Design an enzyme around this catalytic site. Structure first.
Site, PDB file in Angstrom:
ATOM      1  N   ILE A  72       0.867  -1.149   0.000  1.00 28.39           N
ATOM      2  CA  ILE A  72       0.000   0.000   0.000  1.00 28.39           C
ATOM      3  C   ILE A  72       0.923   1.223   0.000  1.00 28.39           C
ATOM      4  O   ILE A  72       1.870   1.279   0.809  1.00 28.39           O
ATOM      5  CB  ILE A  72      -0.855   0.018   1.260  1.00 28.39           C
ATOM      6  CG1 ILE A  72      -1.736  -1.248   1.280  1.00 28.39           C
ATOM      7  CG2 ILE A  72      -1.655   1.306   1.312  1.00 28.39           C
ATOM      8  CD1 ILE A  72      -2.562  -1.433   0.022  1.00 28.39           C
ATOM      9  N   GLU A 161      -2.355  -8.086   2.536  1.00 28.71           N
ATOM     10  CA  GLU A 161      -2.141  -9.415   3.093  1.00 28.71           C
ATOM     11  C   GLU A 161      -3.251 -10.360   2.707  1.00 28.71           C
ATOM     12  O   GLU A 161      -2.961 -11.528   2.396  1.00 28.71           O
ATOM     13  CB  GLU A 161      -1.968  -9.376   4.607  1.00 28.71           C
ATOM     14  CG  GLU A 161      -0.945  -8.357   5.086  1.00 28.71           C
ATOM     15  CD  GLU A 161       0.491  -8.669   4.620  1.00 28.71           C
ATOM     16  OE1 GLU A 161       0.700  -9.572   3.779  1.00 28.71           O
ATOM     17  OE2 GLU A 161       1.423  -7.988   5.112  1.00 28.71           O
ATOM     18  N   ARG A 164      -2.569 -11.544  -0.739  1.00 31.06           N
ATOM     19  CA  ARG A 164      -1.464 -12.498  -0.849  1.00 31.06           C
ATOM     20  C   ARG A 164      -1.781 -13.910  -0.388  1.00 31.06           C
ATOM     21  O   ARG A 164      -1.164 -14.861  -0.862  1.00 31.06           O
ATOM     22  CB  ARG A 164      -0.253 -12.010  -0.056  1.00 31.06           C
ATOM     23  CG  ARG A 164       0.447 -10.741  -0.636  1.00 31.06           C
ATOM     24  CD  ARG A 164       1.447 -10.140   0.401  1.00 31.06           C
ATOM     25  NE  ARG A 164       2.083  -8.900  -0.082  1.00 31.06           N
ATOM     26  CZ  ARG A 164       2.726  -8.039   0.709  1.00 31.06           C
ATOM     27  NH1 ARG A 164       2.811  -8.284   2.018  1.00 31.06           N
ATOM     28  NH2 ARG A 164       3.277  -6.931   0.196  1.00 31.06           N
TER      29      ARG A 164
END
Ligand SMILES: [Ca+2]
Length: 241
Positions: A72, A161, A164
């Site tokens: 980010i 996250e 991912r």
């Protein structure tokens, strides 16, 4: 497409769709073992993507993402932009939110070490979940230097996250009307993401085997070591390399 997520009316499924859509906005160099490999380098004009988030009270923050690594870079609330104090974010500001009436450079970079220090708390003790994301958005939409770091960590884990790892996406998406403290397993995945991706890449050049074992923490709070691509974390969890 316009990648957005509305907490007002949210369900586990709508969060899953938002995360799926966010992953799809990221260019792929190719795929390895069925997992997208992010582009290692892109020219500024193709390097940043936006996602928009609206809290329960219909207040929206727009978020800038570096597509090379899902980091980010900054966010926008109304007419003001906020970017992390780091080289990649300074570049991001040259390509996104260029028309913000006011601009501010956050006091720290987007790394967890800096954010945890700024926040006076570690990720382990900061609730996640959809209600947690609603509050982070409210907190960031009415920016206050003393409360932004903690909220940014909630935002980052709720987007980058989750993008991912399917386990993280699933765990956050399941908390629709409650929050939860992330497990050491969630923290272990976030911390080990670059190491893990690197080993999967190396594995493709080593007949499917890691050159360096990656030690992780499972949901049962147990240490477990990964050494090849047949592992559940590789076949059924990690979603971006
Ligand atoms: Ca890479």
């Amino acid at each position: 497409m316009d990648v957005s997520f509305r907490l007002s009316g949210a369900t586990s499924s709508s969060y899953g769709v938002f995360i799926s859509n966010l992953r799809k906005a990221l260019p792929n160099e190719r795929k390895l073992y069925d997992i997208p490999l992010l582009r290692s380098s892109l020219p500024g004009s193709q390097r940043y993507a936006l996602i928009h988030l609206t809290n329960y009270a219909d207040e929206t923050i727009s978020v800038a993402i570096d597509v090379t690594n899902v980091y980010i870079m900054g966010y926008r609330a109304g007419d003001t932009s906020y970017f992390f104090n780091e080289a990649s974010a300074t570049e991001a500001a040259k390509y996104v939110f260029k028309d913000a009436m006011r601009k501010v450079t956050l006091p720290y970079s987007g790394n967890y070490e800096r954010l945890q220090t700024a926040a006076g708390k570690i990720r382990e003790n900061i609730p996640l979940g959809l209600p947690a994301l609603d509050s982070a958005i409210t907190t960031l939409f009415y920016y206050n230097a003393n409360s932004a770091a903690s909220a940014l960590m909630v935002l980052i884990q709720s987007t980058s996250e989750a993008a991912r790892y399917k386990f993280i996406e699933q765990q956050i998406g399941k908390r629709v009307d409650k929050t939860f403290l992330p497990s050491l397993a969630i923290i272990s995945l976030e911390n080990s993401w670059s190491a893990l991706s690197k080993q999967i890449q190396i594995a493709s050049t080593n007949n499917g085997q890691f050159e360096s074992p990656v030690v992780l923490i499972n949901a049962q709070n147990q240490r477990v070591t990964i050494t090849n691509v047949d592992a559940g974390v590789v076949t059924s969890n990690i979603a971006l390399l």
